[PDB]
Design a protein around this ligand. Structure first.
Ligand code: MG
Ligand code: MG
Ligand code: MG
Ligand code: MG
Ligand code: MG
Ligand code: MG
Ligand code: MG
Ligand code: MG
Ligand code: MG
Ligand code: MG
Ligand code: MG
Ligand code: MG
Ligand code: MG
Ligand code: MG
Ligand code: MG
Ligand code: MG
Ligand code: MG
Ligand code: MG
Ligand code: MG
Ligand code: MG
Ligand code: MG
Ligand code: MG
Ligand code: MG
Ligand code: MG
Ligand code: MG
Ligand code: MG
Ligand code: MG
Ligand code: MG
Ligand code: MG
Ligand code: MG
Ligand code: MG
Ligand code: MG
Ligand code: MG
Ligand code: MG
Ligand code: MG
Ligand code: MG
Ligand code: MG
Ligand code: MG
Ligand code: MG
Ligand code: MG
Ligand code: MG
Ligand code: MG
Ligand code: MG
Ligand code: MG
Ligand code: MG
Ligand code: MG
Ligand code: MG
Ligand code: MG
Ligand code: MG
Ligand code: MG
Ligand code: MG
Ligand code: MG
Ligand code: MG
Ligand code: MG
Ligand code: MG
Ligand code: MG
Ligand code: MG
Lengths: 59, 71
RNA sequence: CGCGGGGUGGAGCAGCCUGGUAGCUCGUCGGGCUCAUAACCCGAAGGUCGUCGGUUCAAAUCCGGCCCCCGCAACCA
RNA sequence: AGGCAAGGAGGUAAAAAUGU
RNA sequence: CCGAGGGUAGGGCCCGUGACUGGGGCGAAGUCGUAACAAGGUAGCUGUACCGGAAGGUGCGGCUGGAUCACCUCCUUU
RNA sequence: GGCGACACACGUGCUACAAUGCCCACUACAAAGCGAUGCCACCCGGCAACGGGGAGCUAAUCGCAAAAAGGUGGGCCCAGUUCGGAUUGGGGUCUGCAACCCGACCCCAUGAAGCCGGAAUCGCUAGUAAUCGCGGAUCAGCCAUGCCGCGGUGAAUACG
RNA sequence: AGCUAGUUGGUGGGGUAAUGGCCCACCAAGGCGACGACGGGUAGCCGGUCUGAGAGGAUGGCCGGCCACAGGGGCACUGAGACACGGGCCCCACUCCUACGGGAGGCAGCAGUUAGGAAUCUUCCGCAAUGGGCGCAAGCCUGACGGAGCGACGCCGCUUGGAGGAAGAAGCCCUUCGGGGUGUAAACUCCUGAACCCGGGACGAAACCCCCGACGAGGGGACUGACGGUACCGGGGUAAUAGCGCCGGCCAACUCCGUGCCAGCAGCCGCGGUAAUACGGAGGGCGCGAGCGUUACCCGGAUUCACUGGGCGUAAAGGGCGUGUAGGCGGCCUGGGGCGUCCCAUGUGAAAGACCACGGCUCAACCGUGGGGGAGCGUGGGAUACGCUCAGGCUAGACGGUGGGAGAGGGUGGUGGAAUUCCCGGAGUAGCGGUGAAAUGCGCAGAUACCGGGAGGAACGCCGAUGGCGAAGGCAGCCACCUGGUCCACCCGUGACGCUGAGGCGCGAAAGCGUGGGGAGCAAACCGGAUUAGAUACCCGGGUAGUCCACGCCCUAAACGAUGCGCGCUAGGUCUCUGGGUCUCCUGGGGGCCGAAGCUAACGCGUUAAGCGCGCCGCCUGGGGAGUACGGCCGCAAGGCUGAAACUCAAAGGAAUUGACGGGGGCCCGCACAAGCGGUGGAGCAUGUGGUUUAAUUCGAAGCAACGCGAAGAACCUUACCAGGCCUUGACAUGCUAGGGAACCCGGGUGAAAGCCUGGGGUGCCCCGCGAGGGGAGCCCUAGCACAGGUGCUGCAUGGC
């Protein structure tokens, strides 16, 4: 799971994009936040798309 | 967000384990797998079994901690 | 109850037997040595030889009894 | 007799674990 | 008659699970030793064998991807 | 008030454990440095620390200051003692506002351990170690046996 | 790794539109196979599509062609044609009705439901076009098709304005406080005028039909739109959506705050543990733009499976060698065949695409038209250099003859001494052996050491080599036998007979195992002793298998030159051994060393190449997993061959280089040890420290290079620590707002002092006024401020030292 901190519990539907993480063992997969139970990275404001964050409203 | 819902609880080091990971017997219940904080590594502050150390525990999985305090 | 052997620095054991003159190893503590730990080395600390007696100028030692500890038998009833 | 060197002797080079 | 298929016994193959076990990789501060890299403190390495907590050890042979080819004393000739 | 606490351990030094010494008395040679509210000649009081009086210098010109070990004479005679000096009691002296914690000094009494030290270890190649005093700086005073400095006596042995 | 029984062929028949094992009866016993059969997996195939410099590699969506299938299987029937997608029959799977006897089903047609799933469309209109079927025709049908709808899914096109407009508004951000950035960007002026409204509005559609003409040609006429009232034209008419990724290197773009190996990022290196150009955010940038990124998958880059184009001594990689089958390759001449090979012609290679030209939709996508190419393949002619093949010949390759030679080549039978042990005999006595020291061990039944003999078994000293032999493993006393290989010399004989070698067959050290023997030493295991923390070990004393032989089997190895074999070329020298010569020098064949050219990553190789080539084989494509699993084979077993993957790591490695290091070497040094004198540690005390205790024992220093150190002077001071009293712009610095008093001195209370509260002398300076009085300088007090202060935390932020 990437981002800034997830909201995922246990019996929750998640979607996977793969792509090796270098550090971790057995884990070749990123969860794609922004779909199903993995709701978007709240407070995220820069690189949105990768994280599933809806547009924040300007002035 | 930078989340400080972190528990800063004391624990007498129980188990000498590999890679400067030490199961430490908390007074917040059992002995979780708690690993050394990087500062300690930098300063070469040695942990042996039997040290009452503050161990940083996130609610997400308390299984793993962090030896925050130098004994 | 009968017989043999032994009881000793904290533990194991030498010395007794052949009168005088108590040692080593492990353990205790301190030091050294080492950059440091063990290892090491050193010491230092520490026994009247189970105990009561007697022997003899003098007993761990010669001798008795008790106290133990080990074992072997304990038969005819 | 010394001079060098080749070879053969034999004596010597003891032992001493680890990692902030 | 031939005949899709079914049934009876046998096998093969794969998939699922599988008690049971082999069990491998990496990991800073786990434990016992210290095998290897320097003649690594008995050269190593190698095949094989037997044995041991474990590295391994030793035997038999092989190799150089092996260092050292010293320093006094004697004999034998230059 | 604390840095000086003290069941302990270590490092660095001093002073020892004696007679190549110790004590007493006389006697003899240094260098280098300092000294102004600083050093203090000399005189008396005091057992003394010092106190008081007081010359001198502004320092090659006075003062600290006696150098000590040494040399002569006396004692001590192998003992824990005339070795040794710690501790502890008492009286004092000085500095300073004040020394109880926590000063130095004098005097008297006290006279502990220690009879040359286990493994280990450190210095030193010549005027050197060993031992003997003196000066200083900081500093009111000093816990200085430290440091820094100066001379006196004066070695050993290096095959390798 | 073998497969096959209608299976391979035959004869006759049937069946078929037709050949045929399609089927059947009978006979034959073949057929296929490593040029890879059968078996398993995989998968419609292709024109193409994507990539690619190309060769290639993958892919086979749409579009076109072919196949195959219509729930799964099996079967026919009818017909020109099916084994029949919306036809039939049957069994089964499944859903549906059922009055339980039986029936009906099949969207892999369009659309839609449902499931699965990351994910994929409207239960659309139309017969207008084009095509299909039927029909004389009208027409009828047509989810073929033509269009529209939904989706940035893809490609392509356009808009989100343009023109001016500051030495630079604000807003935000940074700053060295000046300034810079955003940015002419904005606002504002001017113009245009998507959207949007109204007016018109198609090309696509002229046939089929009717009539003249004979129902022929030809001629006239008519109807005929789902798109769509769309496209498009004419007028009007508004400044009118910007996003997304990145920002350390690759890679284009940099700063600050927040965070502190945390949260986090990551495609790799990696970044984060307090000044992050890598994280979060902000500004700024930079990339693209109605998209942009992520992920998957394919190619590329990967010349990283290499034909173009990599290699193999040490990096992964040469097989252990030999012989040899298939296979591959092959000297020189002459001639023919003409299969390869080339060429020309020509047939093909459908259309679509790709490529060029032009045209059409306002451009372009998209489409149209024309052309060219196109590897391959067939057919006819040609060419013979090269390969093939046939014939003849040659002697350079290769093989043989004869004359010799060297040799630890191999096997079989023997013998010859030293030595060992063991036995007897002798003489002889107090230890031997062993070690870094020792102990176990043997020895008084007399060892050991010495001589005499005998018994064995094993190995072969010196020569002996840096040497010789073999293909390798290997091989040494000597002799005999049998017997291989090889080398030369003559150039005499043969006339290319060769080189290589998947497999196969054979050998194959050492250990091992089986059967039988033999057994001296040595000597795994084992039993002892020491050594040691421990000792399964190094060291010693034994000691069993084994070493030795026969026969059998095992077949591995650093089976090494870590260099596959074969030939040709490409400086030498130097030493060696072995042959011939016209023999202080030539010329062969081996063994080494140095080095030309060249090669190589360097080391090194260098006529014994790793040089230049050619031939063929073996193998390699990151390390670990692992020579392991799994199968298969082989083996009496041990094990061997044959040999993965899953996962995991961003390395495993080679060669060198600089250093460092070595219980590696040589050369050196120093009070480093020795040689010597005096201590330290033991004693007390002086001190400093650690520890401990404290309210605090201030803080640091840490092996040498912390420990009579900072401290060259702690009673208070010092002083940094603690307890108490107290102070606040404050002990000290430069100022401000400013308000009064302000130079100055002397007290008094309280108090441990500091401080606090407080009296009272005390204002002169510049000066204006007659005076009352007024303001400002010095100097000081009060309240807020800017600040002071900190021995407070960091010497891995630093300067100095
Ligand atoms: Mg945490
Ligand atoms: Mg080793
Ligand atoms: Mg026929
Ligand atoms: Mg057939
Ligand atoms: Mg198949
Ligand atoms: Mg398929
Ligand atoms: Mg292809
Ligand atoms: Mg069917
Ligand atoms: Mg028919
Ligand atoms: Mg059908
Ligand atoms: Mg049909
Ligand atoms: Mg069909
Ligand atoms: Mg459908
Ligand atoms: Mg659904
Ligand atoms: Mg679903
Ligand atoms: Mg469609
Ligand atoms: Mg309709
Ligand atoms: Mg009709
Ligand atoms: Mg209909
Ligand atoms: Mg269509
Ligand atoms: Mg503009
Ligand atoms: Mg206008
Ligand atoms: Mg209109
Ligand atoms: Mg850049
Ligand atoms: Mg990012
Ligand atoms: Mg790296
Ligand atoms: Mg990045
Ligand atoms: Mg950032
Ligand atoms: Mg995209
Ligand atoms: Mg290697
Ligand atoms: Mg051959
Ligand atoms: Mg052949
Ligand atoms: Mg050929
Ligand atoms: Mg030829
Ligand atoms: Mg074409
Ligand atoms: Mg065309
Ligand atoms: Mg055009
Ligand atoms: Mg011929
Ligand atoms: Mg010949
Ligand atoms: Mg011959
Ligand atoms: Mg005899
Ligand atoms: Mg001839
Ligand atoms: Mg002839
Ligand atoms: Mg033996
Ligand atoms: Mg032993
Ligand atoms: Mg043993
Ligand atoms: Mg042995
Ligand atoms: Mg055997
Ligand atoms: Mg090999
Ligand atoms: Mg071969
Ligand atoms: Mg040879
Ligand atoms: Mg030669
Ligand atoms: Mg060259
Ligand atoms: Mg060479
Ligand atoms: Mg090469
Ligand atoms: Mg193997
Ligand atoms: Mg197997």
């Amino acid at each position: 799971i990437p981002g800034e901190g997830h909201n995922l519990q246990e019996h929750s539907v998640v979607l996977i994009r793969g792509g090796r993480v270098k550090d971790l063992p057995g884990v070749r997969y990123h969860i794609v936040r922004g779909v199903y139970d993995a709701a978007g990275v709240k407070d995220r404001k820069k690189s949105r798309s990768k994280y599933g964050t809806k547009k924040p409203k300007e002035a | 967000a930078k989340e400080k819902d972190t528990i800063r609880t004391e624990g007498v080091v129980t188990e000498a384990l590999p890679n400067a990971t030490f199961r430490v017997k908390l007074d917040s219940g059992p002995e979780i797998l708690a690993y050394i904080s990087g500062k300690m590594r930098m300063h070469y502050i040695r942990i042996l079994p039997g040290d009452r150390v503050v161990v940083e525990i996130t609610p997400y999985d308390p299984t793993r901690g962090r030896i925050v305090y130098r004994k």
